[PDB]
């Protein structure tokens, strides 16, 4: 029984909509421009041209809250600079325990559906339950913001809306610190590392962190200040949070090489250097080992040697 955000009671509201034969519309975060934004996503912006609020039940004949589990592939960033949040959610899915906390199970578009969903966040120094109606920003029938690789899955889009709600609007989520999201999802201790001054046992730190199910994210801070959000020649994006999803050692040409796996919340655009999906290095590794690690697929997830990682990336964040 978490603390009810703004006093909105999920069960009561759902029950009331059901009895009144209507679907929920949230007075605290209504389907209007003010929930979208105030400037770049404000009512007078071309970025919001053609945006229409629609429920999944208005979009598809068989919408689903969760399809084939709530995993990181269900996190594909939309037209919003909230990679910090999205990278946190992706990592969150790697910890069943915390995942079930944030995303209450038992929600669907079938039995008991009334156009209302809820999520729990660590806010105001406590666990809070936040509700939202399922009206989502769309353009041409497709979700404008976060969406799942599964076109009929909506749990991540609804979770992102709930986070947008407590912050005031989707635009309020434009640009941020991955650690803030980690905290808002765990209430745990966050710590960051300057990769240019990486500890000698940082890889070891990463290993145990991943083992315990901690949340890890990394990013690249470039010189250019007046710009934000942009890729490079090495196909990496700056000021963009990536979820660190694994850390494994392999035998290359007869020796131990420390590798690290991460995922771009865009769900696409990957590193093309050593150890990339179709890189040459995978040929000089025993089939078994490379069969269990390498995956050829444009999914935004890829491996890098730990050596290249600490050179290319500048910041690493870990939640407890
Ligand atoms: Ca899924
Ligand atoms: Ca990949």
Ligand 1 centroid – CA 180 distance (Å): 24
Q: Which residues contact 212 (CB under 8 A, 6 or more apart)?
A: 320
Resolution (A): 2.1
Regarding whether 158 and 64 lie in a shared domain, the answer is: yes
Q: Supply the CATH number for residue 300's domain.
A: 3.90.70.10
For the residues of the chain, what is the DSSP string, one character each?
A: --EEGGG--HHHHHHHHHHTT-----TTS-SSHHHH-SSTTSTT-GGGTT-EEE-HHHH-SS-BS-SSSS-GGG-B--SSS-HHHHHHHHHHTT-HHHHHHHS-SS--SSTT--SEEEEEEEETTEEEEEEEES-EEEETTEESS-B-SSTTB-HHHHHHHHHHHHHTSSGGGSS--HHHHHHHHH---EEEEEGGG--TTHHHHHHHHHHTT-EEEEE---S--SS-SEE-TTS-EET--EEEEEEEEEEETTEEEEEEEEE-TTS-----STTSTT-GGGGGS-HHHHHHH---S-SSEEEEEHHHHHHH--EEEEE-
Q: How far is the CA of 232 from the centre of ligand 1 (A)?
A: 30
Do 24 and 107 belong together in one domain? yes
Same domain, 236 and 144: no
The verdict on 128 and 10 lying in the same domain is yes
Q: For residue 308, how far is its CA from the centre of ligand 1 (angstroms)?
A: 31
Note down the domain range covering 230. 188-320
Do 215 and 168 share a structural domain? no
| Pair (201, 180) in one structural domain | no
| Number of domains into which the chain is organized | 2
Based on the domain organization, do 61 and 120 belong to the same domain?
yes
Domain boundary among 187, 202, 234: 187
CA of 281 to the centre of ligand 2 (A): 15
Q: Are residues 160 and 271 in the same domain?
A: no
Decide: 42 and 33 in contact? Cβ < 8 Å.
Answer: yes
């Amino acid at each position: 029984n978490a603390i009810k955000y703004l006093g909105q009671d999920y069960e009561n509201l759902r029950a009331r909509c059901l009895q009144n034969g209507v679907l929920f519309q949230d007075d605290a975060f209504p389907p209007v421009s003010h929930s979208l934004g105030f400037k770049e996503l404000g009512p007078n912006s071309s970025k919001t041209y053609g945006i229409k609020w629609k429920r999944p039940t208005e979009l598809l004949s068989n919408p689903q809250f969760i399809v084939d589990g709530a995993t990181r592939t269900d996190i594909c960033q939309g037209a919003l600079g909230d990679s910090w949040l999205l990278a946190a959610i992706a990592s969150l899915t790697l910890n069943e325990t915390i995942l079930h906390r944030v995303v209450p199970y038992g929600q669907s578009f079938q039995e008991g559906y009334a156009g209302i969903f809820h999520f729990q966040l660590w806010q105001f120094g406590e666990w809070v339950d936040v509700v939202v109606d399922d009206l989502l920003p769309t353009k041409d029938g497709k979700l404008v913001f976060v969406h799942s690789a599964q076109g009929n899955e909506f749990w991540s889009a609804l979770l992102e809306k709930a986070y947008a709600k407590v912050n005031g609007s989707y635009e309020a989520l434009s640009g941020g610190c991955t650690s803030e999201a980690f905290e808002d999802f765990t209430g745990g201790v966050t710590e960051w590392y300057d990769l240019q001054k990486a500890p000698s046992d940082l890889y070891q730190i990463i290993l145990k962190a991943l083992e315990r199910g901690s949340l890890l994210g990394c990013s690249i801070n470039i010189s250019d200040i007046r710009d934000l959000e942009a890729i490079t020649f090495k196909n990496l994006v700056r000021g963009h949070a990536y979820s660190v999803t694994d850390a494994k050692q392999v035998t290359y040409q007869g020796q131990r090489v420390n590798l690290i796996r991460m995922r771009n919340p865009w769900g696409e655009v990957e590193w093309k250097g050593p150890w990339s999906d179709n890189s040459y290095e995978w040929n000089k590794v025993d089939p078994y080992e490379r069969e269990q690690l390498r995956v050829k697929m444009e999914d935004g997830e890829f491996w890098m040697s730990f050596r290249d990682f600490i050179r290319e990336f500048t910041k690493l964040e870990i939640c407890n």
